[PDB]
Write an enzyme that holds these catalytic residues in place. Structure first.
Site, PDB file in Angstrom:
ATOM      1  N   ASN A 101      20.866  32.534  -6.808  1.00 23.16           N
ATOM      2  CA  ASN A 101      20.267  31.239  -6.613  1.00 23.16           C
ATOM      3  C   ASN A 101      21.182  30.143  -7.173  1.00 23.16           C
ATOM      4  O   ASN A 101      21.170  29.854  -8.373  1.00 23.16           O
ATOM      5  CB  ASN A 101      18.897  31.181  -7.317  1.00 23.16           C
ATOM      6  CG  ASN A 101      18.173  29.877  -7.070  1.00 23.16           C
ATOM      7  OD1 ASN A 101      18.604  29.061  -6.244  1.00 23.16           O
ATOM      8  ND2 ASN A 101      17.072  29.663  -7.784  1.00 23.16           N
TER       9      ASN A 101
ATOM     10  N   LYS B  65      20.722  27.113  -6.886  1.00 21.72           N
ATOM     11  CA  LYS B  65      19.893  25.975  -7.256  1.00 21.72           C
ATOM     12  C   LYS B  65      20.506  24.713  -6.617  1.00 21.72           C
ATOM     13  O   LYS B  65      21.062  24.802  -5.534  1.00 21.72           O
ATOM     14  CB  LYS B  65      19.760  25.891  -8.786  1.00 21.72           C
ATOM     15  CG  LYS B  65      19.288  27.226  -9.435  1.00 21.72           C
ATOM     16  CD  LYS B  65      18.773  27.002 -10.846  1.00 21.72           C
ATOM     17  CE  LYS B  65      18.223  28.275 -11.495  1.00 21.72           C
ATOM     18  NZ  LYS B  65      17.649  27.932 -12.813  1.00 21.72           N
TER      19      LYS B  65
ATOM     20  N   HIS C 291       9.692  29.082  -6.792  1.00 16.48           N
ATOM     21  CA  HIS C 291      10.516  28.979  -7.982  1.00 16.48           C
ATOM     22  C   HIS C 291       9.877  28.083  -9.024  1.00 16.48           C
ATOM     23  O   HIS C 291       9.275  27.060  -8.682  1.00 16.48           O
ATOM     24  CB  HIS C 291      11.879  28.438  -7.663  1.00 16.48           C
ATOM     25  CG  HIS C 291      12.896  28.733  -8.717  1.00 16.48           C
ATOM     26  ND1 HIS C 291      13.042  27.955  -9.841  1.00 16.48           N
ATOM     27  CD2 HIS C 291      13.818  29.718  -8.825  1.00 16.48           C
ATOM     28  CE1 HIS C 291      14.012  28.440 -10.594  1.00 16.48           C
ATOM     29  NE2 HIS C 291      14.497  29.517 -10.002  1.00 16.48           N
TER      30      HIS C 291
ATOM     31  N   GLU D 165      10.967  25.910 -10.985  1.00 16.86           N
ATOM     32  CA  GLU D 165      11.407  24.507 -10.922  1.00 16.86           C
ATOM     33  C   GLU D 165      10.606  23.720  -9.876  1.00 16.86           C
ATOM     34  O   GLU D 165      10.275  22.570 -10.094  1.00 16.86           O
ATOM     35  CB  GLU D 165      12.909  24.462 -10.645  1.00 16.86           C
ATOM     36  CG  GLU D 165      13.713  24.896 -11.841  1.00 16.86           C
ATOM     37  CD  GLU D 165      15.063  25.520 -11.502  1.00 16.86           C
ATOM     38  OE1 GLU D 165      15.579  25.359 -10.365  1.00 16.86           O
ATOM     39  OE2 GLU D 165      15.611  26.174 -12.391  1.00 16.86           O
TER      40      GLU D 165
ATOM     41  N   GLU E 194       9.792  35.323 -13.415  1.00 16.62           N
ATOM     42  CA  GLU E 194      10.530  34.345 -14.204  1.00 16.62           C
ATOM     43  C   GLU E 194       9.840  34.157 -15.529  1.00 16.62           C
ATOM     44  O   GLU E 194       8.711  33.699 -15.531  1.00 16.62           O
ATOM     45  CB  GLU E 194      10.553  32.981 -13.518  1.00 16.62           C
ATOM     46  CG  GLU E 194      11.335  32.920 -12.202  1.00 16.62           C
ATOM     47  CD  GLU E 194      11.307  31.518 -11.664  1.00 16.62           C
ATOM     48  OE1 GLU E 194      12.156  30.692 -12.086  1.00 16.62           O
ATOM     49  OE2 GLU E 194      10.348  31.216 -10.927  1.00 16.62           O
TER      50      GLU E 194
ATOM     51  N   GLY F 268      14.170  26.858 -22.049  1.00 18.62           N
ATOM     52  CA  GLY F 268      14.127  25.616 -22.776  1.00 18.62           C
ATOM     53  C   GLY F 268      13.036  25.501 -23.818  1.00 18.62           C
ATOM     54  O   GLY F 268      12.608  24.395 -24.147  1.00 18.62           O
TER      55      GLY F 268
ATOM     56  N   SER G 137      17.262  34.819 -17.636  1.00 17.30           N
ATOM     57  CA  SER G 137      18.705  34.656 -17.788  1.00 17.30           C
ATOM     58  C   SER G 137      19.422  35.976 -17.638  1.00 17.30           C
ATOM     59  O   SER G 137      19.217  36.899 -18.416  1.00 17.30           O
ATOM     60  CB  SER G 137      19.021  34.071 -19.144  1.00 17.30           C
ATOM     61  OG  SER G 137      20.407  34.163 -19.382  1.00 17.30           O
TER      62      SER G 137
END
Ligand code: NA
Ligand code: NA
Ligand code: NA
Ligand code: NA
Ligand code: NA
Ligand code: NA
Lengths: 252, 252
Positions: free
Chosen positions: B9, B11, B94, B96, B166, B172, B212
């Site tokens: 991906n 992104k 996703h 995001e 995910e 973060g 990750s």
């Protein structure tokens, strides 16, 4: 006199790249009369072929961009990607994005500022819904949208801004807009600009009518004094698009 | 044994088509070991060049699609447009998009159903945020997402579905995911599928780890029994992507 401006917003059409190419070839054969600045906006996936194949006296536009240059934003296309193909324009704030994808004014101001500071030109869309039209509060609603847009525009960049008024109240509501509606709202916007950023900018910014524009009304619309052009919907996929481009000869 | 699956991906990267082309050329020279199904997902504007230039033993993916074939959806790209270039895959859901663009489960189920009924294959993403992880309610949250996805999948189409987990709680937040976290959640998903649509489908659906993934952990991750592959973020833009593709040799 401001140069008349016609943007063809293909929206999420056509379905296939082959149809996109057929459409480009038709546009390429169109005889344009008078003086007019023509911009064609298409789905991201068709932008490379449009930039490659479209007549070079017209410019290509994206229909949206994100607020950042790149990064962790799966699904989003950004200004640098657009510019890498030589594309100079994007639409921002279209009613369909504000309504269906829930884009708010803060998001849109961030996109206008980022776009312009990165050398893009923008077609910034605004307009009121049915209840504000009925209440006679159209000017107020549109004013607040423009006032949110104003601070976004960097110094020296009003030459790169075009504003489109969309009578969202006339979209799927059972109500239709008149020629006078278009003139009144474009004038409203010009006068907001004059009060807020001054007459020199107000006199140069093209303000477009973004309601239903077709071969059967484009000439009467164009003749309105504060209507500087159009952001065309469905007719931009049809031969009638050229009639609309050519209505510039009725605008003074 | 299910065929190991690695999706890269990109992104919203890279910034330019030239960089996209450089990246393609590097991927094209990569020596793949073992047996693995590789899919590369990129920004809509780069999809034509990726489909044109990418090695033909790998497949190209969109990073999103809309719910309809075409129409009044300014800024959106649709399945038919993707398919017109010969692209067979898209990512959906996703983190995001769910978080930043506010995509909800109903919207996502409508996209999965439309995509699949139109011949697409999908990488459907899910996963919990920090508070549900802390509360020990990860399974529950992920279950509800999968239960919303299940009814969307048409009859005969589970062969065309891949699911990516995910750990949004590890993005973060100051917290990191372990190898065991990945195995536990992929197992959770497989067991949900088994209970809800049966063991034959559960045993064939690839479930990917979408946290990750880098050259320094991909081998240990791959070896986990319920981890069938990866949806890779930042390393898909780097040479290390090949290490991750090649970790399939450690999965049984
Ligand atoms: Na009033
Ligand atoms: Na300027
Ligand atoms: Na006019
Ligand atoms: Na628990
Ligand atoms: Na099937
Ligand atoms: Na494994």
């Amino acid at each position: 006199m401001r140069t008349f401006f016609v943007g063809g917003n293909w929206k999420a059409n056509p379905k296939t790249v082959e149809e996109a190419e057929k459409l480009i070839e038709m546009l390429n054969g169109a005889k344009v009369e008078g003086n007019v600045e023509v911009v064609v906006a298409a789905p991201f996936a068709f932008l490379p072929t449009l930039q490659q194949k479209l007549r070079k006296d017209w410019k290509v536009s994206a229909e949206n961009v994100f607020t950042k240059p790149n990064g962790a934003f799966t699904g989003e296309v950004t200004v640098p990607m657009i510019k890498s193909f030589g594309i100079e324009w994007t639409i921002l704030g279209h009613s369909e994005r504000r309504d269906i994808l829930k884009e708010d004014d803060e998001f849109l101001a961030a996109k206008a500022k980022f776009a312009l500071e990165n050398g893009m030109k923008i077609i910034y869309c605004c307009g009121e819904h049915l209840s504000e039209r009925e209440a006679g509060k159209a000017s107020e609603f549109v004013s607040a949208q423009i006032e949110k847009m104003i601070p976004a525009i960097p110094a020296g960049k009003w030459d790169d801004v075009v504003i489109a008024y969309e009578p969202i109240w006339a979209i799927g509501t059972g109500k239709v807009a008149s020629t006078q509606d278009a003139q009144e709202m474009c004038k409203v916007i010009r006068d907001i600009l004059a009060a807020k950023v001054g007459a020199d900018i107000a006199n140069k910014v093209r303000i477009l009518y973004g309601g239903s524009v077709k071969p059967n009304n484009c000439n009467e619309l164009a003749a309105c004094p504060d209507v500087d052009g159009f952001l065309v919907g469905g007719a931009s996929l049809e031969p009638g698009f050229i009639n609309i481009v050519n209505s510039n000869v009725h605008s003074k």
